[PDB]
Write a protein that binds this ligand. Structure first.
Ligand SMILES: *[C@@H]1O[C@H](CO)[C@@H](O[C@@H]2O[C@H](CO)[C@@H](O)[C@H](O)[C@H]2NC(C)=O)[C@H](O)[C@H]1NC(C)=O
Ligand SMILES: *[C@@H]1O[C@H](CO)[C@@H](O[C@@H]2O[C@H](CO)[C@@H](O)[C@H](O)[C@H]2NC(C)=O)[C@H](O)[C@H]1NC(C)=O
Ligand SMILES: *[C@@H]1O[C@H](CO)[C@@H](O[C@@H]2O[C@H](CO)[C@@H](O)[C@H](O)[C@H]2NC(C)=O)[C@H](O)[C@H]1NC(C)=O
Ligand SMILES: *[C@@H]1O[C@H](CO)[C@@H](O[C@@H]2O[C@H](CO)[C@@H](O)[C@H](O)[C@H]2NC(C)=O)[C@H](O)[C@H]1NC(C)=O
Ligand SMILES: *[C@@H]1O[C@H](CO)[C@@H](O[C@@H]2O[C@H](CO)[C@@H](O)[C@H](O)[C@H]2NC(C)=O)[C@H](O)[C@H]1NC(C)=O
Ligand SMILES: *[C@@H]1O[C@H](CO)[C@@H](O[C@@H]2O[C@H](CO)[C@@H](O)[C@H](O)[C@H]2NC(C)=O)[C@H](O)[C@H]1NC(C)=O
Ligand SMILES: *[C@@H]1O[C@H](CO)[C@@H](O[C@@H]2O[C@H](CO)[C@@H](O)[C@H](O)[C@H]2NC(C)=O)[C@H](O)[C@H]1NC(C)=O
Ligand SMILES: *[C@@H]1O[C@H](CO)[C@@H](O[C@@H]2O[C@H](CO)[C@@H](O)[C@H](O)[C@H]2NC(C)=O)[C@H](O)[C@H]1NC(C)=O
Ligand SMILES: *[C@@H]1O[C@H](CO)[C@@H](O[C@@H]2O[C@H](CO)[C@@H](O)[C@H](O)[C@H]2NC(C)=O)[C@H](O)[C@H]1NC(C)=O
Ligand code: NAG
Ligand code: NAG
Ligand code: NAG
Ligand code: NAG
Ligand code: NAG
Ligand code: NAG
Ligand code: NAG
Ligand code: NAG
Ligand code: NAG
Lengths: 426, 426, 426
């Protein structure tokens, strides 16, 4: 519902913390085309060669993906090359960050430990065999390690957190310039159209709301990571497909191959083998094609995650719903299995009241407009106040400016404007 | 052309409304792999099985697309879960929205009705047969319904429009805070560097320009939707491909299959059938691969559409050419066949004049800089004015600030600065 | 390191120019499916036909890519349809642009000439044969020209540069409004939270830092374009794959085809040919699939490049690290082989000092907060100054506002606030 002469203004607010989860990378894997199709079989390999460079081209396609996975990770996390550490003082004006910062007693935060025990991991079996020996045991299917291990990533997130708390966003665009945390917040409030005194006067309340919100995150995650689990599940499916297809005949007398090389005459075996090669090759092509498309989807997500790091963590965003719902104040990154988790801190208006309003005020024949905020009435008196928080002030010449006259504006009301000068000169 | 001592400033402006069309989704379809390849043929099915899980993997790929289509739609439209309705008063200060709001006498707006009669729709034939019976008649090719029907989508767009008009952007980031429409506009003007008095003084003109612009949209659309039609046409092609390939022999004696099962001996038929299976299977793979790539393109468009909803409709954008050409004021969404249409309202400078300018003014040995706007000369007198609209004001101590001295600045000119105090004390 | 009572403020700054390179398009190519598979062979063509419309569908897929390549180019470059030229005066207040502007004595800039001699170019051989004759010589593989030639692109970049220098960003959102360059910069400084006097007082230094930075770009590029070279290299690989596969037997007696048509009996040749057709067809499908995926990657890059043009060149960005590291002032586009190069001009804080700070000042029982900037102490006196550049000013009633009282704020310090009125009345 709405009207043409009344406005609603929040008289209170709350602080909310929301969680956004993005995938960044996937397990780096590859397939040895020849070993997969022709498992330690000289005759098969000789028959595979006549088909040209199919295996070379497919090996290249998969290699490109494996490399991309490291590129994605470093672009998201390794944005700041200087490593920063937090002080032992732990005095941020009542703001308790003990749940997001690394625990000295792996050096990860409490929240990160929760995340790393929610994602559930062929790959297990490969890890157990541990590399040529494994490659043979798993029919050409191998698993590659990342360049950046979990510990290295944790160090990057730690540096970002230490930076954000100590020097705000300045370290993300130049030298790290230390500032008291309570002050850092004041400017984040200004950035959302709220004056500084609101923070300083309500600092205790704000710190309490913030600390409570963080505790809620723990309960929310404990009782969420489907987006990251789904990536793992899809990859498990793709690998299971390749393994199962090795048991298919596709018109052959046997998927074994060795039962074709033996028993059958040379040329007879060759026909049956060429058949198996064709079927296994197209099975591999199907796998590769889907991996390329899926990889592209992840790349797009990694690019978004990198963007959010720059705009949500290393600065303050003015883009609606980009860094969480409500008005963006700040963000804190956390590491996660093959991904990144953002904790977005936002300002949300709470309890509003209805006031009578007017576009402009007529004083001495001239129309006065507010420099900022709106004109409102409590039923007997008119006040000027900021839009995002009810804080009524006397309407004075230092709160308004003059333009045109009282005969032009439609929604013009008669009132007085206080002049903070003459009354103390007379 | 340009110079080093002169500036051009707009003395008038116009309001423009532009239309941007994005695809969000495509018809949800799927293919029953076995039915397509082996149409009610026991012998064929038995020969298909030996090829492994190809059909399972392909069915999964297509299913994933069909699901994604609903995900895309709800992300774009279902951003606000609270449904809002407009009042019967229809008083928005002279702004006529009767062409964008739903018509009580399907509950769609006039403009939406135009859009829904411009897109032209295998699919027609399927709709006519209406589900197993149809699946058999169409050789395994089926069509699935959306979770959100056109009526439900219209309700979401209606809620967004009611919200935008009544509470501006506040409902997109918290509680809906009612405000007079004319005032809402004032703040949208501030957001583009234009003062409030410009709107209130020219409210009648602005409303007329706006209303005229909307009427032009009707003529533009009536006399546009190629982006949405192209998506339909591409999908029609892909389905036609699958159907036509069922008439190909690919070396077989016949594409009929039944003419192979009969006449030929058991093993003879089996060879001819295995051939048909291979050709039909690779034809299906070709279709699926292209559908996956095309689907990715749509997803990317849906993500952009969702972003625009949040940044153009539920707020005011500061990104150049993101929400139309010119300075962004506001946007209004409209529904469309498998897509979304945005009407972008922008401010455009009209008629500029040339003025002589100067970086700073020297008064009593000190250099005065403008707090905002520029210093300009009309040939005899110097004035200070805002950049996006010519509105010359007297240069006073309340319009400028002092820094350094007259011997530092290169483009320094001699003039007087009026002090709005002493003249009324003496 | 950080503390709860001290702040660091830059006392100097530098100007940096960084280079960002994006791909926009790739060489437009296509393959004549029939000619590739059946090179001037009637018998082969007749055997190809029985396989249905595979070639038609593949030809369409490749055609779609070739068309997209022109769409990508025009979206990035042809954003402004009006062509602008620079004056012969070349007076921009000490800013030397002679290295980015076109050289009258191809009409390209010095920097562009460097870029166009760094990218290294099957395609060479095709250019040498120069169209049916070539298509036959190269087995159905052809090369298509762009709609926009290098000269036309250079004209678009020239217009953008002339526009940016003469009318700033206004031409990107309406009529081109001339402004002195030195003034244009002043507003770009305001956009990053720095006052105007900083530019005008240090204009000479700033121009020198800028001019030096540009010279560094020449040395950087001369001593970089791997992103663009990689695109070329990948395409060369894809084409080499197709050519090499024409020498594969895939079980055939010969890849020659003519040695199959001859020697062998009609039905014997037909079997061997059907085999070759199947292998060549799947080789072509592999090529096409990878081209579609790669093309999508380029499209995404072109979309980003187009976005940067609008937000970095035709305006000033507030997005962190979107238009280079540091605080964005402006950008200048340069053309490049199948891509675009952006020179990003950014402001970077240099040498900071430590000061003692305080949230608010207590005067006569009331708490005074800064209208802008921070309160700092040099050890004996308190001052108020802007955050991004140390410039200490006397704390006065015109620099602060009053809210609440001295008993509410925690970090409250006792000091005096100067009233710029009474002292000259008494
Ligand atoms: C910051 O928050 C943590 C977590 O709630 C607080 O740690 C708890 O402190 C209580 C009181 O001593 C103990 O009983 C709990 O066992 C502690 N929990 C954990 C996980 O250690 C910490 O005291 C808070 N610090 C401040 C300054 O508020
Ligand atoms: C603004 O809302 C907050 C709640 O977020 C109010 O603070 C609560 O006040 C009640 C008493 O009415 C206490 O029991 C709660 O413990 C307080 N919560 C917190 C986090 O301190 C606050 O009083 C409200 N202020 C106004 C002006 O309404
Ligand atoms: C509107 O606000 C004014 C100012 O606060 C209210 O007037 C004051 O009311 C208090 C009692 O709560 C008196 O002690 C003050 O002396 C009054 N000041 C003046 C100038 O009259 C006024 O009552 C409020 N109106 C409504 C409807 O709440
Ligand atoms: C808002 O715009 C609509 C559409 O132009 C106006 O409706 C027309 O009003 C005239 C005058 O009565 C009729 O002759 C037309 O037939 C109406 N057109 C339609 C489609 O209904 C409407 O009157 C305008 N309302 C206001 C307040 O301006
Ligand atoms: C600004 O431009 C508008 C046009 O958009 C002018 O308004 C028109 O004025 C003519 C008379 O010269 C009328 O016949 C038209 O009907 C008016 N159009 C509208 C929509 O009202 C306006 O006068 C110009 N103002 C200035 C100062 O130049
Ligand atoms: C520049 O603007 C000034 C102020 O409007 C013009 O001076 C006024 O001109 C009007 C006639 O149109 C006189 O009635 C006023 O008394 C003049 N005021 C003053 C202070 O002289 C001035 O003529 C304009 N200059 C040009 C070239 O247009
Ligand atoms: C702008 O920069 C160019 C490039 O450095 C300057 O051109 C050089 O000028 C010197 C001095 O006359 C010559 O010795 C060099 O050979 C010139 N280099 C080139 C490439 O032409 C130009 O003089 C500068 N102009 C201004 C106003 O600073
Ligand atoms: C700010 O930094 C600049 C360097 O970017 C200083 O300018 C240099 O000053 C030295 C003398 O100390 C000269 O030899 C250099 O040639 C100057 N460089 C340039 C480009 O002019 C500047 O003096 C510093 N200003 C302050 C206040 O520290
Ligand atoms: C803090 O700044 C003040 C103001 O500049 C310094 O006081 C001045 O010092 C100069 C000598 O450099 C004297 O000539 C002025 O007369 C002093 N002014 C006043 C009001 O005392 C002060 O010394 C600086 N403090 C520190 C630690 O540098
Ligand atoms: C404001 O007025 C609207 C419309 O009557 C009403 O629905 C809403 O509850 C009112 N809010 C308050 C705080 O009175
Ligand atoms: C507000 O709307 C009412 C009709 O409900 C009308 O009578 C009144 O004049 C309008 N007020 C203004 C300032 O337009
Ligand atoms: C405002 O006061 C003037 C007299 O100075 C009077 O003529 C006018 O009608 C009044 N307007 C209103 C809304 O009371
Ligand atoms: C402003 O000056 C330029 C350059 O001479 C000229 O092209 C333009 O038409 C002039 N505009 C006006 C309104 O005089
Ligand atoms: C403007 O350019 C002219 C040359 O055309 C020059 O003589 C004049 O001094 C310049 N003015 C300023 C303020 O630089
Ligand atoms: C400005 O006035 C001063 C005298 O106060 C004079 O010395 C100076 O040359 C004048 N500057 C100009 C541009 O007229
Ligand atoms: C500021 O203080 C920090 C912490 O002691 C120190 O590391 C830094 O070097 C100091 N900077 C200056 C300019 O004194
Ligand atoms: C700053 O921190 C110190 C502890 O290191 C503390 O004693 C002091 O009171 C704090 N100052 C303020 C304003 O909080
Ligand atoms: C500020 O001055 C008041 C007296 O007006 C005194 O009571 C208070 O303690 C002083 N505060 C500080 C920090 O010196």
């Amino acid at each position: 519902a709405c009207s043409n002469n009344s406005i609603a203004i929040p008289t209170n607010f709350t602080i909310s913390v929301t969680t956004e989860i993005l995938p960044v990378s996937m397990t780096k894997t590859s397939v040895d085309c020849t070993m997969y199709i022709c498992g330690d079989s000289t005759e098969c390999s000789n028959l595979l060669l006549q088909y040209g460079s199919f295996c070379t081209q497919l090996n290249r396609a998969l290699t490109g993906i494996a490399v991309e996975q490291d590129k994605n990770t470093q672009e998201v996390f390794a944005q700041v090359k200087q490593i920063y550490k937090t002080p032992p003082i732990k005095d941020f004006g009542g703001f308790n960050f003990s749940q997001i910062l690394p625990d000295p007693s792996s050096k990860r935060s409490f929240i990160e430990d929760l995340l790393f025990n929610k994602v559930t991991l062929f790959i297990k079996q490969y890890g157990d065999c541990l590399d040529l020996i494994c490659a043979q045991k798993f029919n050409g299917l191998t698993v590659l390690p990342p360049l950046l291990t979990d510990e290295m990533i944790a160090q990057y997130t730690s540096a970002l957190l230490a930076g954000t708390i100590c020097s705000g966003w300045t370290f993300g665009a130049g030298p790290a310039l230390q500032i008291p945390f309570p002050m850092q917040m004041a400017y984040r409030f200004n950035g959302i159209g709220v004056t500084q005194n609101v923070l300083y006067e309500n600092q205790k309340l704000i710190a309490n709301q913030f600390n409570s919100a963080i505790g809620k995150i723990q309960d929310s995650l404990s009782s969420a990571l489907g987006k990251l689990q789904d990536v793992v599940n899809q990859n498990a499916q793709a690998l299971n497909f390749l393994v199962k297809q090795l048991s298919s005949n596709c018109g052959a007398i046997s998927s074994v191959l060795n039962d074709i090389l033996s028993r059958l005459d040379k040329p007879e075996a060759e026909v049956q083998i060429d058949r198996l090669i064709t079927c296994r090759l197209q099975s591999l092509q199907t796998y590769v094609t889907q991996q390329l498309i899926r990889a592209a989807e992840i790349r797009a997500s990694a690019n978004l995650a990198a963007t959010k790091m720059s705009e949500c963590v290393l600065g303050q965003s003015k883009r609606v719903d980009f860094c969480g719902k409500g008005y963006h104040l700040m963000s804190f990154p956390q590491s996660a299995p093959h991904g990144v988790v953002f904790l977005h801190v936002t300002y949300v208006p709470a309890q509003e009241k209805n006031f009578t309003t007017a576009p402009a005020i007529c004083h001495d024949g001239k129309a006065h407009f507010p420099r900022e905020g709106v004109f409102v009435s409590n039923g007997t008196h008119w006040f000027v106040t900021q839009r995002n928080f009810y804080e009524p002030q006397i309407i004075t010449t230092d709160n308004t400016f003059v333009s045109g006259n009282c005969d032009v504006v439609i929604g013009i009301v008669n009132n007085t404007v206080y002049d903070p000068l003459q009354p103390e000169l007379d």
